[PDB]
Symmetry: C3
Subunit: 439 residues, 3 copies
């Protein structure tokens, strides 16, 4: 009776463990970082494959930019075929895998609460198991913990593939966030500061372990992802060779990245299925890829040139006594609100213009502000002055405890929030900290 069913179940669990084990397929490039991450990469692939083979649903959340979309689509491309080979139902693909972008740089409560409500409905209504959750290009920080506390109330297992700094280290290779997730694939564990190995690179390698058969289809994705995130990693320069083999040079890759970020701005919370795959060149439909990229890119380029031409006259640029070129722009007063490009993207376009004119290695700091936020971008040259945005933000919060100062990101790129009524004081204090920097 129950003994028959239990003994058969126990054997099924064991055979699932065995079949889920990924092969050691190595990597597409040479990298000591990837080699050091191999055990966690193989564990991630094991967990994903096991969910697939047991008919458990998967939710894949990814950040909504080129690197994130590329990473998410890499994983989807490996997963879907496996789901289709083991499922009798042709609806299984659509039902047992969901990809959802996150516009925020962390797993927002609105996102996780939606994921929980949706998964609980499928559970109660159709008897589905609760899903494996895979978070990509997000998830590896302390800001993600609130979401994970909620998922753990449901016994949900969680895979993270990210390349942002977890920051709060509890040991040499363990961060605070790691206690709330089951496997965390992140270069920062094996080499602190190695942001340049991006989510799309990591995710493509994980995807190869999940399903070695999709290698040839996706091996160029890391070049697209690295272009999106502007990686200067030795791994990236190897990954580029796979794109070249398919006829994509470096300018092609840049156009593709710009197209993805533009289209994703407009489709918002939708996932771009039916479009993103064509842009990323993972279907055999070369003509549709060309029509999309050649149709869209000129439009994107023209918008950027138009907005730059109109906004640039309002950018104040001063060379400070220490040699720093400090640029400021009020993107509430002198930018089109709610339109492409967003303040973040606009600040990048302005910053790039100053880099093209004066050089990336010149010390350039671009501050783009609204009523209650500022986006900050620092050229590589700012490293010569030990510019660290996180340190400056902590300083500002301590000097102005009533101004609601918050944020940061990278030491060289990120954003600040503050109370609108204390903007003048916060930004003047920010400027004083920049003046005081020493070579």
């Amino acid at each position: 009776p129950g003994s028959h069913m239990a003994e058969v179940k126990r054997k099924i669990e064991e055979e699932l463990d065995r079949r889920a084990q990924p092969s050691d397929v190595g990597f597409l490039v040479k990298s000591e970082v990837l080699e050091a991450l191999k055990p966690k990469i193989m564990k991630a692939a094991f967990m994903i494959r096991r969910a697939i083979f047991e008919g458990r649903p998967i939710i894949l959340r990814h950040h909504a930019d080129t690197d994130g979309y590329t990473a998410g689509v890499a994983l989807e491309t490996a997963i879907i075929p496996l789901i289709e080979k083991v499922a009798p139902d042709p609806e299984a693909r659509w039902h047992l895998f969901k990809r959802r972008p996150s516009r925020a740089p962390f797993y927002e409560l609105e996102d996780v609460l939606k994921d929980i409500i949706f998964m609980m409905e499928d559970h109660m209504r159709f008897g589905d198991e609760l899903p494996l959750v895979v978070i990509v290009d997000n998830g590896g920080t302390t800001e993600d913990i609130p979401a994970y506390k909620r998922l753990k109330a449901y016994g949900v297992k969680i895979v993270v593939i990210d390349h942002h700094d977890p920051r709060d280290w509890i040991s040499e290779d363990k961060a605070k966030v790691d206690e709330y997730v089951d496997v965390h694939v992140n270069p920062h564990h094996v080499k602190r500061g190695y942001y340049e190995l991006t989510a799309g690179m990591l995710a493509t390698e994980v995807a190869r372990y999940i399903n070695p058969e999709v290698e040839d289809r996706i091996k160029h994705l890391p070049a697209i992802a690295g272009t999106g995130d502007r990686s200067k990693a030795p791994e990236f320069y190897q990954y580029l060779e796979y794109a070249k083999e398919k006829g994509l040079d470096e300018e092609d890759l840049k156009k593709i990245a710009e197209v993805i970020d533009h289209e994703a701005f407009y489709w918002k919370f939708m996932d771009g299925r039916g479009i993103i795959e064509e842009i990323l060149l993972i279907t055999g439909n070369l003509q549709r890829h060309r029509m999309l990229v050649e149709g869209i890119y000129p439009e994107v380029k023209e918008k950027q040139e138009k907005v730059l031409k109109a906004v640039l006259p309002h950018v104040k640029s001063v060379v400070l006594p220490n040699g720093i070129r400090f640029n400021t722009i009020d993107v509430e007063l002198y930018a089109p609100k709610f339109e492409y490009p967003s303040p973040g993207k606009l600040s990048g376009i302005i910053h790039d213009h100053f880099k093209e004119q004066y050089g990336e290695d010149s010390p350039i700091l671009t501050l783009a502000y609204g009523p209650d936020f500022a986006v900050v971008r620092a050229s590589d040259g700012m490293a010569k002055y030990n510019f660290d945005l996180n340190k400056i933000v902590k300083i500002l919060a301590e000097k102005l405890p009533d101004a609601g100062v918050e944020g940061g990101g990278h030491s060289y790129a990120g954003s600040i929030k503050f109370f609108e009524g204390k903007r003048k004081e916060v930004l003047e204090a920010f400027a004083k900290e920049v003046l005081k920097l020493k070579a």
Copy 2:
């Protein structure tokens, strides 16, 4: 032919009337107000049970706060089992009952128009009857009439369970809104001003008449609802005993209420199914309830403390000649826009702080304003000065006919709207009315 079908239909209608009659199960507490409301309570339960037994769908709309969610979930908990016992289809639960929160304190046109479009699709596409509409913690005022005029164009029957003042009385126990709905359960009909018998209390009692079998599961809900709405009713202090029996003390209840209001802020238009039931302790899954409340509450507490610490230095507090402590805070300039806590919730947190420091019975008036709105909170002590927000709003509208003044709510708690360009004049006139109050 048609005579066979018609005679059988007529007998089915009569047996439906008979079976729908609820038993007189009394109440969970002693209350002359509930006793006086019994006929309408029994009518509400009759209408709901009848819809269920005829296979008619039900839409339940409720305000999106602790009292409203609690009330809605109380009713759902009684209804779903009955639907499942009479329906052959296991999809009947999901199809023939819908719970939809309303963030507005009235049945907004966007909500009712969506309800009508959705119900008309089910009608035309699947042949469903048009639903019984049950509105809870909303619906009992003149601001709800526009929605009801639209529903009545479709011959829809409407149950209202609310505890806000209908205001526009046409007789001793009948208000203007009552002409547009089929049964209105509201303590104000039998005892004017008795707001402290809240929707979750009322709805739990209605739920017991709908389905006496769920009594033990939901009899603690009124304690949660009353905590959310800060009821000081004699009924509330009895209802608390049912929560104590299940191990929930008064601090537990407060944490639960704070958790609901926090989570509901983030899930927005979603209904929280799969989560809210766990927080409200109506499943047997004690561990999940604990993980959610103990996981979430510290996070909620920390956000409130952080925001309070940052905002408090910007609150102006003056004791006026008449003894009133008048607090003002610009929540556009000195609060985080679009984040938890909302302006309404923030004003409450600031107001509570002033109450803790100076006492609830001291006369405290907290005015939190943005560009074009203000939230007003008056301590019990303000009653000694005959403070009435609705009267003050009428005065302001008459003195400043070009300023677009509108709103009110309770005599002691509510909000004003006005034209941004007349803010100074409106708020200075508001302050003069407060100065002129006499003990």
Copy 3:
């Protein structure tokens, strides 16, 4: 084998061509413009009928105002019955036709990207062919081309039924946009400037060619559409007679139009199915139509009167030396934000008031502005001064290249956008251009 299937397919294509041919049913009114548009009208109907007969889905996009809704519903009313007669499945109606409003006056990227994602899902998941796309009261301009470039990457066929000026003419009867669509029905091709033959007029005639059987049901729709768009066309005054036959006088039509624009404001991205048909009087349910229009219209009228009374004292009206009456109103400072009526609608209500008081033929220019936009309305009297908004906008952009000036619309009605920080300069320059106009 493949020869059997291919020969049968070829014959099916030929019989589809034959059956899709519409009858020459003439028109409901006398019109040289319609006569000149007949070949394109018949082509539009051919393409729509062919899609229906082959079981291809149709997406109908329309602008979200009275004229657009009326046009969309006219076409839906003709299409649905044909779909139902040729489809075995009773779900075919719901699956093979979709009507989606567009709030923007062009085919926005957010709309088209959603259409592409949705159509690609149906394609991949259910094997549906890609749809015929029909755009109505939008689509006939250069601002629509980006959407069409994306649709053409998927080989999608596109029908446009619009009455806005394509502007960018490449020959006498061909505009730039025409290269991206398969048939464009627009009076401007055969008579430049003939905006007064509106989308609902055009669409009703197309609908008659699609399905002559629905003529009697929809022949009054053009009167509603023309009322919404305030057409003074000779065709309109004929179309009115069909409304009179059904008991709708000119005041009834105005109430209907005001009701549609009000309700559509609140249901937003939803399509109003189950409601709009009743308001438009195309069902046999006269009582529901009456309850909706008589229930809703007084509420609409009261809102307009209330807002007008409160806002009018803030309108500055000056008669300029040249005789022009120039009205200005700051609708950010002195109007209710986010509520009915929108800035566009509010400007119309203010403008109408000035027209009622001083006459339509008096030269009246109403400028309603926010932080970063302005809505402009010119009475017929402004024609005596050669007022052209598009020319003025070009002038402003050239004089103020750093102010981000954009927009236009009609020579007499439209809107400008600009950078908030250059508002003063843009509006003062706008006012100088108006001062300089000569009779």
